[PDB]
A paper describes a structure:
SARS-CoV-2 papain-like protease (PLPro) plays a key role in both viral replication and host immune suppression and is highly conserved across the coronavirus family, making it an ideal drug target. The main protease and papain-like protease (PLPro) are responsible for the cleavage of nonstructural proteins 4–16 and 1–3, respectively. PLPro cleaves the C terminus of ISG-15 (RLRGG) with sub-μM affinity allowing for the virus to delay the immune response, resulting in increased levels of infectivity for SARS-CoV-2 compared to other members of the coronavirus family. Although we were not able to obtain crystal structures with the NMR protein construct, the full-length protein (residues 1–314) containing two cysteine to serine mutations (C111S and C270S) did produce suitable crystals for X-ray diffraction with structures for 3 different protein-fragment complexes being solved.
The X-ray structures confirmed our NMR studies, showing class A fragments bound at the S4 subsite adjacent to the BL2 loop region, while class B compounds bound at a previously undocumented binding site in the finger region. Class B fragments were found to occupy a pocket near the zinc binding site in the PLPro finger region. The triazolopyrimidine ring of fragment 11 is placed in a pocket containing V187, Q195, T197, T225, and K232 with a hydrogen bond to a water molecule bridging K232, while its phenyl group is extended into the hydrophobic pocket formed by V188, G193, and C192 next to the zinc site. Interestingly, the chemical structures of the class A fragments (e.g., 6 and 7) and class B fragment (e.g., 11) are similar in their primary structures, yet they bind to distinct sites on the protein based on the different NMR shift patterns and the cocrystal structures. Despite their structural similarity, the methyl group at N-1 is the key to the binding preference of the compounds. This nitrogen is observed to create a hydrogen bond to a water molecule, which links to K232 in the finger region. Although there are well-defined binding pockets and clear avenues for elaboration in both classes of fragment hits, the increased flexibility of the finger region and variability in binding pose make the elaboration of class B fragments a more challenging prospect. Additionally, the distance of the zinc fingers from the active site of PLPro and the lack of conformational change associated with fragment binding raise concerns as to whether class B compounds can modulate the activity of the protein. However, no inhibition was observed for any of the class B fragments, despite many having a higher Kd than their active class A counterparts, suggesting that ligand binding at the zinc finger region of the protein is not capable of modulating PLpro catalytic activity.
Author numbering: -1 to 314
Write the structure that this text describes.
Amino acid sequence: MREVRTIKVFTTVDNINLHTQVVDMSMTYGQQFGPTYLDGADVTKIKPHNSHEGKTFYVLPNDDTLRVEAFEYYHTTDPSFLGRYMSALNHTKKWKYPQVNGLTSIKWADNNCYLATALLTLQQIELKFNPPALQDAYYRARAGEAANFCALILAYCNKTVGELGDVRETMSYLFQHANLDSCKRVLNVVCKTCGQQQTTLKGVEAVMYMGTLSYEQFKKGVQIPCTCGKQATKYLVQQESPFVMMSAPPAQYELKHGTFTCASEYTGNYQCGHYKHITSKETLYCIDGALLTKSSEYKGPITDVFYKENSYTTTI
Ligand SMILES: Cc1ccc(Nc2cc(C)nc3nncn23)c(C)c1
Ligand SMILES: [Zn+2]
């Protein structure tokens, strides 16, 4: 029929290791590679153009070499991961990432305010990621090119662009891919009936607590039901970590300058709302995507507070 015409392109799963391919310009990328993406755009149903020659396309890990490369870079073997990452990237590459008070933020789009406050929070706590994909993308994000980092957060969290997201859950996912091995927490629970029992927590469980926003109150003791039915007290015995994260269902809470690192504010309900970020510097700054305001005091519906730590031992 038609004289065969070809171009050379490269396929990849990590945008570093390239794989030479010769493609037939009369067949779609999908017929030759399976699902195929060009900087996030789905080109599966597109036939090669001359302008494509020499360009790099993402594909799914469909042979053993690509499977190993994908696991080594992303630390996942979820079959749909790369598709979800590319689908997110096609949107996040169009977002804007302004510098707000020296931090990379995200201009509002696509219901992304939970991602903005997560990204702002990471830049204020000591954290190293384990997957090279997150290491590389986070470095770019700090420099101001955060599109790949934001698309990876979405893919790791199984959230699509626009989907309702929770900051505490997002942070927990990101912490699972970070090196928290040297973090340790010891708690004690005291019941006037049953007595007392210590517990040691490690890793992500050592830096996250759900039930109170106040780190000081956590050191003093919080009231929880004992398994016997009577009210008991749980308090922090020992902490070794560079930060802690305290979370609670949103409630009116007063943030005092100098007593915390940063916080997440949620205005809304369980199906509808909006996040803002508060950071304690020379004064209290409220970052709302690209928007910035200041105040000497702050009271709002807070749901997460971050604090600095290094080593703490109770006197109780
Ligand atoms: C001897 C004894 C046995 C059971 C309990 N009850 C308990 C222990 C722990 C570790 N966490 C708890 N959360 N709710 C209750 N908890 C206590 C305080 C002492
Ligand atoms: Zn008890």
